[PDB]
Amino acid sequence: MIVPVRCFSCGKVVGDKWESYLNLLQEDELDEGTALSRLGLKRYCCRRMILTHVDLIEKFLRYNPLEKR
Amino acid sequence: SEGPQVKIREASKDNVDFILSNVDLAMANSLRRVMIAEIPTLAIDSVEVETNTTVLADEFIAHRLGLIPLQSMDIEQLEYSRDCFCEDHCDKCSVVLTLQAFGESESTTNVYSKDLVIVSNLMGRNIGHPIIQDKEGNGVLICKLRKGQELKLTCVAKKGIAKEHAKWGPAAAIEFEYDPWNKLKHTDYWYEQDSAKEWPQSKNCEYEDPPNEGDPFDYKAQADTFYMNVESVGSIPVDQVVVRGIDTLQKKVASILLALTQMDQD
Amino acid sequence: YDRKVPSPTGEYVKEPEWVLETDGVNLSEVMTVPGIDPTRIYTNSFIDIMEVLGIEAGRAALYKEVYNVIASDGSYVNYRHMALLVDVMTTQGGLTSVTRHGFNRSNTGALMRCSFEETVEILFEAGASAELDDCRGVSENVILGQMAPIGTGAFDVMIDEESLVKYM
Amino acid sequence: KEKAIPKDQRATTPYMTKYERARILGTRALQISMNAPVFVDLEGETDPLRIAMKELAEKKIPLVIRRYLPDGSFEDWSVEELIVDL
Amino acid sequence: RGNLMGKRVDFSARTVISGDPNLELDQVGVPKSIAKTLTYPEVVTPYNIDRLTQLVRNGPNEHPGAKYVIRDSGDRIDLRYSKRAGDIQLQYGWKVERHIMDNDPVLFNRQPSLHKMSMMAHRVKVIPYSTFRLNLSVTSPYNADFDGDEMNLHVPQSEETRAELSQLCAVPLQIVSPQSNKPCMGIVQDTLCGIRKLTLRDTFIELDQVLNMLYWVPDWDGVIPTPAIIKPKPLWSGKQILSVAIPNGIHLQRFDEGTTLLSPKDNGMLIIDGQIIFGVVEKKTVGSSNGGLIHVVTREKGPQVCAKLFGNIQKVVNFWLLHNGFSTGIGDTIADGPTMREITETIAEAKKKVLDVTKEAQANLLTAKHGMTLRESFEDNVVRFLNEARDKAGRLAEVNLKDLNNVKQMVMAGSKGSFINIAQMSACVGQQSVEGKRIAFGFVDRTLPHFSKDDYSPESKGFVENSYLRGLTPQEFFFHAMGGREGLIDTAVKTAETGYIQRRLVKALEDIMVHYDNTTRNSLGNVIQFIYGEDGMDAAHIEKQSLDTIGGSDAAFEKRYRVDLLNTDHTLDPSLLESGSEILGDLKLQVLLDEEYKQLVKDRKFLREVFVDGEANWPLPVNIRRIIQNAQQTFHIDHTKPSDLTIKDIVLGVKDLQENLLVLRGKNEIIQNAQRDAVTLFCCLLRSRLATRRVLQEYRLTKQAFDWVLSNIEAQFLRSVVHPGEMVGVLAAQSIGEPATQMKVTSGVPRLKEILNVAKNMKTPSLTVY
Amino acid sequence: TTFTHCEIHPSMILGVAASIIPFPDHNQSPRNTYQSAMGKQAMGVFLTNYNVRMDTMANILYYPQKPLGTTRAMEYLKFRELPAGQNAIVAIACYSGY
Amino acid sequence: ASRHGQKGTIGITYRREDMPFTAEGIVPDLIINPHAIPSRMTVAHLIECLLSKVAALSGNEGDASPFTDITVEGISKLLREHGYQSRGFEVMYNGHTGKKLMAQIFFGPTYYQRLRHMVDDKIHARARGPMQVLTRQPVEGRSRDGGLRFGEMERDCMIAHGAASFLKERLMEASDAFRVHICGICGLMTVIAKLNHNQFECKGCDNKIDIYQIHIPYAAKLLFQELMAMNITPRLYTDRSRDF
Amino acid sequence: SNTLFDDIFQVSEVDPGRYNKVCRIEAASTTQDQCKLTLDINVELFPVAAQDSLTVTIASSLNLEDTPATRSWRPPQAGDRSLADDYDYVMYGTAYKFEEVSKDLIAVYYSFGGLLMRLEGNYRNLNNLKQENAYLLIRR
Amino acid sequence: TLSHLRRTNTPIGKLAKPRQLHNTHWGLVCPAETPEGQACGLVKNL
Amino acid sequence: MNAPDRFELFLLGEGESKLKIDPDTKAPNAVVITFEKEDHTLGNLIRAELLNDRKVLFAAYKVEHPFFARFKLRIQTTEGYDPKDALKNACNSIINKLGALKTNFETEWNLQTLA
Ligand SMILES: [Mg+2]
Ligand SMILES: [Zn+2]
Ligand SMILES: [Zn+2]
Ligand SMILES: [Zn+2]
Numbered sequence A: 001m002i003v004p005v006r007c008f009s010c011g012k013v014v015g016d017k018w019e020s021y022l023n024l025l026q027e028d029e030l031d032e033g034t035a036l037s038r039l040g041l042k043r044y045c046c047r048r049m050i051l052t053h054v055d056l057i058e059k060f061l062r063y064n065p066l067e068k069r
Numbered sequence B: 001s002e003g004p005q006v007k008i009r010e011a012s013k014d015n016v017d018f019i020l021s022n023v024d025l026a027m028a029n030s031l032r033r034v035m036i037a038e039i040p041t042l043a044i045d046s047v048e049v050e051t052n053t054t055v056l057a058d059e060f061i062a063h064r065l066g067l068i069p070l071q072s073m074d075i076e077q078l079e080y081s082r083d084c085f086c087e088d089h090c091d092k093c094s095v096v097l098t099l100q101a102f103g104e105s106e107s108t109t110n111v112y113s114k115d116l117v118i119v120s121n122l123m124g125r126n127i128g129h130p131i132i133q134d135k136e137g138n139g140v141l142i143c144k145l146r147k148g149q150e151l152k153l154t155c156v157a158k159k160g161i162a163k164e165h166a167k168w169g170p171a172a173a174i175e176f177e178y179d180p181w182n183k184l185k186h187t188d189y190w191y192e193q194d195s196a197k198e199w200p201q202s203k204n205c206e207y208e209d210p211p212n213e214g215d216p217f218d219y220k221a222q223a224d225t226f227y228m229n230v231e232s233v234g235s236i237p238v239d240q241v242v243v244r245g246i247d248t249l250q251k252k253v254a255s256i257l258l259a260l261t262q263m264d265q266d
Numbered sequence C: 001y002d003r004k005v006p007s008p009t010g011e012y013v014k015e016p017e018w019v020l021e022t023d024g025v026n027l028s029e030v031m032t033v034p035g036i037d038p039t040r041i042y043t044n045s046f047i048d049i050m051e052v053l054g055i056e057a058g059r060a061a062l063y064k065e066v067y068n069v070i071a072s073d074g075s076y077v078n079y080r081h082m083a084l085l086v087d088v089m090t091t092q093g094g095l096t097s098v099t100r101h102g103f104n105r106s107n108t109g110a111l112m113r114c115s116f117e118e119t120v121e122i123l124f125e126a127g128a129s130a131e132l133d134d135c136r137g138v139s140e141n142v143i144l145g146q147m148a149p150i151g152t153g154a155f156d157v158m159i160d161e162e163s164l165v166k167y168m
Numbered sequence D: 001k002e003k004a005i006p007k008d009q010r011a012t013t014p015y016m017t018k019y020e021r022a023r024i025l026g027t028r029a030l031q032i033s034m035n036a037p038v039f040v041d042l043e044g045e046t047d048p049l050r051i052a053m054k055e056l057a058e059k060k061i062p063l064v065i066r067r068y069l070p071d072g073s074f075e076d077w078s079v080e081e082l083i084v085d086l
Numbered sequence E: 001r002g003n004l005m006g007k008r009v010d011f012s013a014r015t016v017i018s019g020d021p022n023l024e025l026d027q028v029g030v031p032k033s034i035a036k037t038l039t040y041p042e043v044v045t046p047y048n049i050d051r052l053t054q055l056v057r058n059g060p061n062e063h064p065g066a067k068y069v070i071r072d073s074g075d076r077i078d079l080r081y082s083k084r085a086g087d088i089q090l091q092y093g094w095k096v097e098r099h100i101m102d103n104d105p106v107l108f109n110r111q112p113s114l115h116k117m118s119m120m121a122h123r124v125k126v127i128p129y130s131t132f133r134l135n136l137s138v139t140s141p142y143n144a145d146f147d148g149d150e151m152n153l154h155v156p157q158s159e160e161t162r163a164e165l166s167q168l169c170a171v172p173l174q175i176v177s178p179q180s181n182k183p184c185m186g187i188v189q190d191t192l193c194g195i196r197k198l199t200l201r202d203t204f205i206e207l208d209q210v211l212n213m214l215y216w217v218p219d220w221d222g223v224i225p226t227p228a229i230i231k232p233k234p235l236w237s238g239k240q241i242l243s244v245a246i247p248n249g250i251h252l253q254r255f256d257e258g259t260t261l262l263s264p265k266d267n268g269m270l271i272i273d274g275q276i277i278f279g280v281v282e283k284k285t286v287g288s289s290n291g292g293l294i295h296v297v298t299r300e301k302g303p304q305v306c307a308k309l310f311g312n313i314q315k316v317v318n319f320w321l322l323h324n325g326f327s328t329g330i331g332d333t334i335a336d337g338p339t340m341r342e343i344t345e346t347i348a349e350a351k352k353k354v355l356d357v358t359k360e361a362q363a364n365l366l367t368a369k370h371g372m373t374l375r376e377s378f379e380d381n382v383v384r385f386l387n388e389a390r391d392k393a394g395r396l397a398e399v400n401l402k403d404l405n406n407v408k409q410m411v412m413a414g415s416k417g418s419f420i421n422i423a424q425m426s427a428c429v430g431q432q433s434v435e436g437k438r439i440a441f442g443f444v445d446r447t448l449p450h451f452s453k454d455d456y457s458p459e460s461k462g463f464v465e466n467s468y469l470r471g472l473t474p475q476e477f478f479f480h481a482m483g484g485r486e487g488l489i490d491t492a493v494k495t496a497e498t499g500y501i502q503r504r505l506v507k508a509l510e511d512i513m514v515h516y517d518n519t520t521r522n523s524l525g526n527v528i529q530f531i532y533g534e535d536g537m538d539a540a541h542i543e544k545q546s547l548d549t550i551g552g553s554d555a556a557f558e559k560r561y562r563v564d565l566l567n568t569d570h571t572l573d574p575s576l577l578e579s580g581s582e583i584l585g586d587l588k589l590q591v592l593l594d595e596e597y598k599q600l601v602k603d604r605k606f607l608r609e610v611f612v613d614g615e616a617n618w619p620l621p622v623n624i625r626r627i628i629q630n631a632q633q634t635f636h637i638d639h640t641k642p643s644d645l646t647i648k649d650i651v652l653g654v655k656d657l658q659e660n661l662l663v664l665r666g667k668n669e670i671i672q673n674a675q676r677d678a679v680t681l682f683c684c685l686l687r688s689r690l691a692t693r694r695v696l697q698e699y700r701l702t703k704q705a706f707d708w709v710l711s712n713i714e715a716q717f718l719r720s721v722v723h724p725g726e727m728v729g730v731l732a733a734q735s736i737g738e739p740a741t742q743m744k745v746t747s748g749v750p751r752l753k754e755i756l757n758v759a760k761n762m763k764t765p766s767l768t769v770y
Numbered sequence F: 001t002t003f004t005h006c007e008i009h010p011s012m013i014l015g016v017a018a019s020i021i022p023f024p025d026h027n028q029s030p031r032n033t034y035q036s037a038m039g040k041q042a043m044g045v046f047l048t049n050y051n052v053r054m055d056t057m058a059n060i061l062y063y064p065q066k067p068l069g070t071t072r073a074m075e076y077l078k079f080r081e082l083p084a085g086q087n088a089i090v091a092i093a094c095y096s097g098y
Numbered sequence G: 001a002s003r004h005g006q007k008g009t010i011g012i013t014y015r016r017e018d019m020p021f022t023a024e025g026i027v028p029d030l031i032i033n034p035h036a037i038p039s040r041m042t043v044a045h046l047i048e049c050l051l052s053k054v055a056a057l058s059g060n061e062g063d064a065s066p067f068t069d070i071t072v073e074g075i076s077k078l079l080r081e082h083g084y085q086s087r088g089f090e091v092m093y094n095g096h097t098g099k100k101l102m103a104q105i106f107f108g109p110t111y112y113q114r115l116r117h118m119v120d121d122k123i124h125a126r127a128r129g130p131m132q133v134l135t136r137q138p139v140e141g142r143s144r145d146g147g148l149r150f151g152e153m154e155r156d157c158m159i160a161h162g163a164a165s166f167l168k169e170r171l172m173e174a175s176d177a178f179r180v181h182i183c184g185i186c187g188l189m190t191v192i193a194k195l196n197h198n199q200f201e202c203k204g205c206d207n208k209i210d211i212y213q214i215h216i217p218y219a220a221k222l223l224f225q226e227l228m229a230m231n232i233t234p235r236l237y238t239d240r241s242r243d244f
Numbered sequence H: 001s002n003t004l005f006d007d008i009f010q011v012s013e014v015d016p017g018r019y020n021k022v023c024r025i026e027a028a029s030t031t032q033d034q035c036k037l038t039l040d041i042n043v044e045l046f047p048v049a050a051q052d053s054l055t056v057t058i059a060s061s062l063n064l065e066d067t068p069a070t071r072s073w074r075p076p077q078a079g080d081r082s083l084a085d086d087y088d089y090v091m092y093g094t095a096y097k098f099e100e101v102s103k104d105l106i107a108v109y110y111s112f113g114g115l116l117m118r119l120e121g122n123y124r125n126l127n128n129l130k131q132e133n134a135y136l137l138i139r140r
Numbered sequence I: 001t002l003s004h005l006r007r008t009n010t011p012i013g014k015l016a017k018p019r020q021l022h023n024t025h026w027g028l029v030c031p032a033e034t035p036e037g038q039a040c041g042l043v044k045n046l
Numbered sequence J: 001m002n003a004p005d006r007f008e009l010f011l012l013g014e015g016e017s018k019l020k021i022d023p024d025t026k027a028p029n030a031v032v033i034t035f036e037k038e039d040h041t042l043g044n045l046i047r048a049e050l051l052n053d054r055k056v057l058f059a060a061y062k063v064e065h066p067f068f069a070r071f072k073l074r075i076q077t078t079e080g081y082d083p084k085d086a087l088k089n090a091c092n093s094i095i096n097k098l099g100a101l102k103t104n105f106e107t108e109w110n111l112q113t114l115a
Helices: A018-026 A032-038 A044-051 B025-037 B058-066 B203-207 B238-265 C027-031 C046-053 C055-072 C079-089 C119-129 C138-144 C161-166 D018-033 D048-058 E032-037 E049-058 E136-142 E159-168 E190-198 E207-215 E238-242 E293-300 E303-324 E337-363 E374-400 E406-413 E419-426 E474-508 E554-561 E587-610 E624-635 E647-660 E669-678 E680-689 E692-699 E703-720 E728-742 E749-756 F029-041 G036-040 G043-058 G072-080 G152-161 G164-172 G218-229 J040-051 J083-109
Strands: B005-011 B015-021 B041-052 B070-072 B095-102 B109-112 B127-130 B141-145 B150-160 B171-177 B226-232 C002-006 C012-016 C020-023 C155-159 D063-068 D074-078 E007-009 E012-019 E027-031 E039-043 E066-070 E076-078 E095-099 E105-109 E119-127 E132-134 E150-154 E229-231 E252-254 E269-272 E275-278 E527-529 E543-546 E617-620 E766-769 F086-092 G030-032 G105-112 G124-126 G148-150 G178-183 G192-194 G199-201 G211-216 H003-015 H022-029 H036-042 H053-059 H089-100 H105-112 H115-122 H133-139 J019-023 J030-036 J056-062 J070-077
Touching (some): B005 J083, B015 B238, B015 J083, B025 B171, B025 B226, B025 B238, B025 J040, B025 J083, B041 B058, B058 B150, B095 B127, B095 B141, B141 B150, B238 J019, B238 J040, B238 J083, C027 C046, C027 E766, C046 C055, C055 C079, C055 E728, C079 E527, C079 E728, C138 G218, C155 D018, D018 D048, D018 D063, D048 E159, E012 E027, E012 G148, E032 E119, E049 E095, E119 E132, E119 G152, E132 E136, E132 E150, E136 E303, E150 G148, E190 E238, E190 E303, E190 E406, E207 E238, E207 E303, E207 J040, E238 E303, E293 E624, E337 E374, E406 E419, E419 G036, E474 E749, E554 E587, E554 E692, E587 E647, E587 E680, E617 E680, E624 E680, E624 E703, E647 E680, E647 E692, E647 E703, E669 E680, F086 G043, G043 G072, G152 G164, G178 G218, H089 H115, J030 J083, J040 J056, J040 J070, J040 J083
Parallel strands (some): E027 E119
Antiparallel strands (some): B005 B015, B070 B127, B109 B141, B171 B226, C002 C012, C020 E766, C155 D063, E007 G148, E027 E132, E039 E095, E066 E076, E066 E095, E105 E150, E229 H089, E543 E617, F086 G105, G178 G211, G192 G199, H003 H022, H022 H036, H036 H115, H053 H133, H089 H133, H105 H115, J019 J030
């Protein structure tokens, strides 16, 4: 749903690069591979972690909250 | 001092690359294994949820919190909860963090690791602070909230080793190679037409001379001159990762010796 | 076809012979045609072999058919199993099928025969005929929940006082 | 008792069968587990099955097998005189 | 059927199964929760009072523990809710229901459970997790894998059933199946590949790894074998290390095509005194095959020794392959450019031949093969050409494959795959057939809406020219899918029909048993066979042996068997025995030899009358060749010095051993005749093997070795006799039904059905006339 | 030279389940059938409103990932929006016999 | 299971320090036996692994549509452009010792699916439990602590093994076992037994000293009572009347 | 102990076959015209080429002084003296067959852990080879 | 869910083999998606 | 659920000792040492260092089951040399070698600039 905190294979921290990856794709008009390389993800285990992630939390946030406060 | 040799090729805050020469294969493998699975580290272990109106589950958030890397430079000054004399936890064996996030804005608000606030007495130690390793100054994207949603929880972090759970692992990928030219014939290279042309040359090949191209196979040679590269998640400095791996291995061997002496007495 | 006939020297050699394969079976009429070898004619249908040559010949043909079916896939089974099956099928003088109209119509106890098929009909017939079941079968002993006379139950274990007195 | 064949004309195999051995061992193990007198010296044993196996090896089981025939007759064979070769 | 013949039972467990290479053959891993749930009632005795008291104190929440305590009055106490009064005092004769501990025998089964080897007894091993764990070598009898399969476990509740389970249904006792008198278990998958890779001549192991491999063998004596190569570096061969797991005294010889003692291809097998001399170990040696290492070990040393062999081989090979490695990838299915060119040219030539035959048929100059229509003959020729094209392309690809190819390694070791698999993955999928015929014209005069009407080309009628590596074109994909659908439907329908057939056969032959008079009778007492199997032997003790008298030429028979002391044409060399100087010119010994030769000639005539085809290899109870080899290797026959045997001794020993070969023990003429007829054939084999010339010239046996051979033959024959009380009816029904599940004229399941049900009218009646 | 129609794309002969298999033309057909059957038992995200639906049983993968090797047909099946599986680093080897 | 018919269960779990590793430090998240490839001829699995490796390295989505121009040779060339062996083989090291494996391992990403079948949802054992009202046998269904079925095939296998005592124990002690009183005159089990008063009576036969007790399955008792309802008289007798 | 056989052979040819570390060499005796040797050699540790002369010896033991699974093999110790010190290639194996080729020609088959040797020669030259284990020593 | 919404069924005295994949099925029902049990070939997917 | 607690891998249980040494009757001067809550990390290192001793004839280690975190080490030395003393020597060699390596790594690291 949300970006994983750690890479499954090796344990590198990748949960702090989702916003940077999206910003590189949108504002900088960079390709996915170039953005992944620029973010410091060298091993394809982390490259797939960030490349194949699907952000379903954005869709889940479209529903009105069940409980208010 | 005339024992194992070390030559650092590249040193950084996240990766340390070195050549470990005049050492045994068993020793090098044990070093990497200990650096992967037996270096103590501080990580969130228990979470109590006071309010959770998020679209995510409590166990989901707890797992994400437990995977956050925390500073563990002074971990040796902390005590194991199992070995501490306290009911549940105290300042001598645990660190308490608090997270409070509210959707005060119409747009989506992101809850990061920087929002965790330490409410325990660190006693002048250097542990507990979440690691920030990005330009923007935020940390791990723990969660997202919309307007009207609140996340309130308290985390208790205890020291442990990656053998118990991977979240305590302070070391990322460890490059480990030896004999890049296959001079010991420890591998039979799979090939279709030419193995040399079909198998790319490792970057470490520049540090060893190529085969003499006609010399007899050396049956007296033994593995040595290992090329290693340790990557750290940021919990502790990479040089500290290596030093504490060696320390842990030494302590384990010393424990074996001490147990042997204890049995000798009886 | 290739058949191994002993050579005049003494060795076994293969020689070619002409064999006629026919669709349809008229064994009695074909066997009397001059020129053929009546002592080697064979039929796929073991029923005709049984009717023309006898129950023993039908037994042999049935075993041959079963062996052919088993070995067509390349599998091998010990002779005695197929021999026992064919002997059971031919033990009453005719070709007894393995269906409810064959072995299930014998006199082997209502409690045993009803366990296969036509349970209620068999039980009603037994009640009408006042059948007596000796409970010699595994099915009967299983229904009654008592040790069947098979394997470890095919004998009675008794105590030996003659040896008890001398074992001290 | 016309169904009891005299010992002088027994025609059954003189070798104990696998089923006979299994039942003898099980029965003797049950008796031992129910606190039965053991006629063999024990060098240290707690399993009734192992004790029964020792008794069978030394031919000290006071049991006789009554082998039945399809006609209803039977033959009595002592465990001591039955050969255990399987 | 739903509540009496079968019913729900207690003291049972079910869960997913897994493979544990570190578990013995008969060991089964049981989850701790299942162990804590299942209980065994143990009677309190002076030998276990303290242990049972400790378990009771432990209680039902700690393994090992106890759940109930039953007093001599029959009342039951739940240890839960009972601790209020403290620990109970145990008394003799009480029962403590305690958790199933290690080494407890339990019955392990897998449905459908089509044969007796699918339900065997295992020893419990309490392990951490939520899955049963079983040795890999016992998967074949269960017909089970680890894709999600479940197996049932049953716990006996009495000492009698416990002993019966451990003495009749134990896994080691079921190694040699009676269905095909060959082992039913063997090395499989990873271990079958690893042993083949380890036994290669190029496999050498250094000291450090050799020590660990040796220590991995539980029964290793502790003696380090001398390395094959001493200088300039100590290196041990894979054969040398593997020989440690084989028990001493085992001899095995097998010759493959072109095999010689100087085996240049390292094929065949030769093991002497438990040491592998030469030959790569593969499925033919450690697999579940007739005459293999498993068969020899289980028939010579015993089922327990064979079970230990399984574990030793698995452990050593698993360690070696763990530290060696083995994989497979896309590169293994790729052939070089020249081979692909040759394959393409072969397929093109086959297609050209198909075009030529099609053109001739369209010109009407083709004559129909006799007994078939023109179209049928044309289709037969086309199918033959295309099938031969696929076979040739597969042969080319396999020849091109190198020794380092992983798929080739698997195929050579016999672990998995085959020539058809290699050809389809690398060269050509081939012709697709539905109902044994090419793809029919589903549309009007065409197969798909992409060809022209009345098209008979291979690509139009379903010939997949491409391979899986290349990929199938859409039309080939559809035709291949049609074939696969045919296969799936056949699988389902045949499963159902075979299940029904197996039930019918078992119900028909359930009540047949061998009685103490060796007769096979049903519940009614009716005699089915006057002696089981017409020989009185048990299938598990039958082995294939060659009859040396039926075969061979007359000159060979005369040379091998005839011995003469008067003439000098077939004289016996005086150096073969210590009395060869005074044996010449003796009429008493001459008449004895004449009688022996006359009996041998009569035996040859009878054998040729019985086996008209002249086949000499038939299943027989006792393996005389192994007995002779064991005698030779045990007594260290000199092979040069003359033996002390005498012709009188040899002849009389064989003759009187024929008397000790007893199957029926009646003391009347009828039973005596039956006894003679029961062993007439085995007597023929015995006489053929233990001949005077054969013994003195070929075997060089000594007096002591000959006596030992006779005694061992008698013991083996007496052990091979069928045990009274065996349910041969159920055994035969299962043995005939189990192959049916895996199953011009009708064959297979339809023909088996037509046989079991006496059909008045069959599909394809036929006559064979000579 | 008498064609009257042309296929839009042969890959459209497959169904919903069979359109997830990558390179199905390189596979034996029974394996394709098995995968078609099994893909309906893989965990994913059946709907985005599982937090408001009350079904008897439901399974939701923590971190769904879209396949690295995708098929053009899946774009219309929304496999990249609600994926059922993960991209695991797989090695084909005989390591320990387990 | 993967997307190619390759389904399997987790035999065992290993930590990162015990898993094999490459020179790059990448460890496998899953290991499958090579022997599953040849017989099943799932070349699509290998091609998908190679394509996924290339896609992960280059930052793209692999085009795995069935009928296209993509070929293994092209994927291999692309992979070799990234500094990896063209066929995806990599040199690996043993995690226990660190020595290079003699053979090279096919290593790469692959799409795997978690199926609905979990061992924790199937594991169940029973020593004793509730019995059904009708047959007084163990109840069906693992959710209700039910037992397993010892069917006709299991009975036949045990008969072949010759374990008569085990068969009897399974059918009686591990399942319904009922004691009934039968009259010696009539085999009918219509004997009223006042066990507390130690009295027995078979009204109709006018006897009180000719009663026997037998142990039979409750299913057998139910069958006999049903036959009695259907007017059939199964009379149980403890002595033989005809010779063999 | 003592040399059971010794000779000098001229390697007629070497065949690597399908193996990468083991090669089969055919050689004939330099002094006897009726003596030939076929031997499997680990060429990775002792390469052999055509037209090479090899001194071949077969002994019952490696200890110098005569001493006519025996004992647990142990790594060589410093200062240990044995026949192996005088040669380059040493193997240990067992004889598994003696075959009569002609009236006076006898062949002995040896197996060194899967590496096969066949020594064919006269009966008066191969009379000291027994059905037992032996060491094979090769010196270039 | 998509496959279930696009499933079809065929009720099986008839003299034919409806379980086979006919040629006319091309482009109309999936040639590979079908149950492996007793419904193999009777349940089709568009 | 029957998954054992993860701390069982390294934490020693009640009534359990780190080392369990028993004589081996298979050969003279041979001993078997069971290491509890230990794995290949120590097994391989200790065995490799033992193999370097000239007075050690046999040194091997094995892990019977990966489920349990314990391994067995078989050591056989020459006559007159105690296997216990051999193990002590190997452990001391390991400690000294590791200390030297640590000092070398520290001195080398102090010479860098980027970190
Ligand atoms: Mg399965
Ligand atoms: Zn990673
Ligand atoms: Zn504390
Ligand atoms: Zn009455």
